[PDB]
Amino acid sequence: MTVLDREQVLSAFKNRKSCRHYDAARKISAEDFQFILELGRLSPSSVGSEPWQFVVVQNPEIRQAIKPFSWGMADALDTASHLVVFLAKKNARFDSPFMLESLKRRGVTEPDAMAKSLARYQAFQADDIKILDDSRALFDWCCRQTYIALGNMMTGAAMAGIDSCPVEGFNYADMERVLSGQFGLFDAAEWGVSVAATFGYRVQEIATKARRPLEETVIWA
Amino acid sequence: MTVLDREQVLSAFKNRKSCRHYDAARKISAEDFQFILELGRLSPSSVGSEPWQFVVVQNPEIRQAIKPFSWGMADALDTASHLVVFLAKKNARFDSPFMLESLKRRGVTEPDAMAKSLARYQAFQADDIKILDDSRALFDWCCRQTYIALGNMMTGAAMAGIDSCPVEGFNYADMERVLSGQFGLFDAAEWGVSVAATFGYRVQEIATKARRPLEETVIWA
Ligand SMILES: Cc1cc2nc3c(=O)[nH]c(=O)nc-3n(C[C@H](O)[C@H](O)[C@H](O)COP(=O)(O)O)c2cc1C
Ligand SMILES: Cc1cc2nc3c(=O)[nH]c(=O)nc-3n(C[C@H](O)[C@H](O)[C@H](O)COP(=O)(O)O)c2cc1C
Ligand SMILES: O=C(O)c1cccnc1
Ligand SMILES: O=C(O)c1cccnc1
Ligand SMILES: [Cl-]
Ligand SMILES: [Cl-]
């Protein structure tokens, strides 16, 4: 365990501010950006599902195709170093091939053990969080996991001096149609767009943004 | 900006492993836990909504009350230093008083300016992410934001040497009934249970868990 002082941790964490305007001349190096991708890869996920894909949109033709409906990051599409569109797994039922592969990656591979795990996953999805019925709720469950990877990538990037902005401000149906249909980047039957993020170096200073006081957020029980 | 080297960031990030069994005698100090809550407070959220409450469940009467349906953390309820149950805002429509407050906290308070922002929020919610036809989709939108705070609190804790585990393994309807109905901790019309996390100091070594290779997660475009 490599342990940092919590004051140093908090200080670096406060580096992260949503950046809408990047220096178009400055690119994140390939090695620096793989480190950001690694924070996403290593993030936790319910049952180790890792129900995400990271679409790195560096092709300016694709950035221009999505600009008309991406008002939340319109300027950044011309100036950001990197763009990631997060995909979340569709129909991640306990009995799906995708979930089976995630179960073996947890180290559960003997057939009787696998059956017992799947039975618990079925009860969780059907009885506890109640998502097995509804395909949109099942998709939203996986989307939730991708916001963990999103948060970790942005935080880690900022601690290392690289700016970012989380992004929901786009038409989700158009984004899926362009990325999956026009450019054929993923099978939209298996994956759906969750959220996006830009990364780069800020063009100017960014003011720290307000938060509600802790006493209006924490409930002590 | 106080900047850390990315190899130092990655090394400290790798401290985080899901911990199911804590040292029951080891308590996180008040100051250290305030630091953890602060990581969640400062987390970003869509339109700065901050649609979360953090219920800190330190009362062992409450912990024992939720244990029978909390199989995902049954042993940790006896041994964890701290437990946080994350609530997400219900019915966070563009025209709700809660969203009005978050908009003023962004520094938009002139009535014509506020009116124009709320018009954009309405279009975002109705047309882009499409969450205004279903109260569950609206609630799930807020739940996604809470997983950012979850990710940041666990990573930051781990970087400072404090173990954690994210938790979905409980009956969600029972959790709301006990926390809101039996113990009156929140108004269930206004807030719903999103996810939980335990925090403490691990009782034994934890093996690093596998992840899919980056080449099966990253789509270069
Ligand atoms: C949202 C969420 C909920 C989870 N729920 C639980 C749970 O209820 N019980 C449990 O033992 N672990 C749970 N985990 C931990 C995962 O099993 C774990 O993150 C995954 O197997 C990867 O292992 P690692 O986190 O140690 O790298 C949860 C993880 C996430 C992100
Ligand atoms: C899921 C999510 C989506 C967001 N969408 C956008 C967006 O489309 N456009 C944008 O300018 N900012 C967006 N933001 C940034 C928020 O406005 C910002 O986090 C919040 O106002 C607080 O500012 P700070 O992040 O600088 O503290 C998003 C944030 C999150 C977490
Ligand atoms: O990740 C896990 O092990 C898990 C997730 C949900 C419910 N129970 C266990
Ligand atoms: O946070 C924001 O400012 C935001 C979120 C979604 C869409 N447009 C803007
Ligand atoms: Cl900016
Ligand atoms: Cl453990």
Residue numbers in the entry:
A (entry chain B), B (entry chain A): 1 to 221
What does the article say, verbatim?
To understand better how variation in the substrate-binding site mediates activity, we solved the crystal structures of the NfsB homologs from Hi KW20, Hi Int1, Hi 86-028NP, and Nm Z2491. In contrast, Nm Z2491 NfsB was much less active in vitro, with ∼15% the activity as Hi KW20 NfsB (q < 0.0005), apparently driven by a much larger Km value. We found that the NfsB homologs studied here have Km values for chloramphenicol ranging from 160 µM for Hi 12 NfsB to 1,300 µM for Nm Z2491 NfsB, although all enzymes showed apparent kcat values near the median enzyme value of 13.7 s−1 (∼9 s−1 to ∼22 s−1). For example, the N. meningitidis NfsB enzyme has a comparatively low kcat/Km of ∼8 × 103 M−1 s−1 for chloramphenicol in vitro. When expressed in Es. coli, however, it confers an ∼8-fold increase in IC50 and an MIC double the clinical resistance cutoff of 8 µg/mL. For structural changes specific to substrate binding (e.g., nitroaromatics), as opposed to coenzyme binding (e.g., NADPH), we focused on comparisons between the Hi 12 NfsB structure complexed with 4-nitrophenol, the Nm Z2491 structure complexed with nicotinic acid, and the previously published En. cloacae structures complexed with 4-nitrobenzoic acid or NAAD. The phenyl rings of nicotinic acid in the Nm Z2491 NfsB structure and 4-nitrobenzoic acid in the En. cloacae structure coincide with the niacin ring of NAAD in the other En. cloacae structure. Intuitively, the Ser68-Met74 pair found in Hi 12 NfsB would provide more of the flexibility needed to properly locate and orient Trp71 to make space for the ribose of NADP than the Pro68-Ile74 pair in other H. influenzae NfsB homologs (Pro68-Ala74 in Nm Z2491 NfsB). Including the 4-nitrophenol-bound form of Hi 12 NfsB, the root mean square deviation (RMSD) of Cα atoms among these structures are very small with a range of 0.36 to 0.61 Å for the H. influenzae proteins and 0.9 Å for the Nm Z2491 structure.
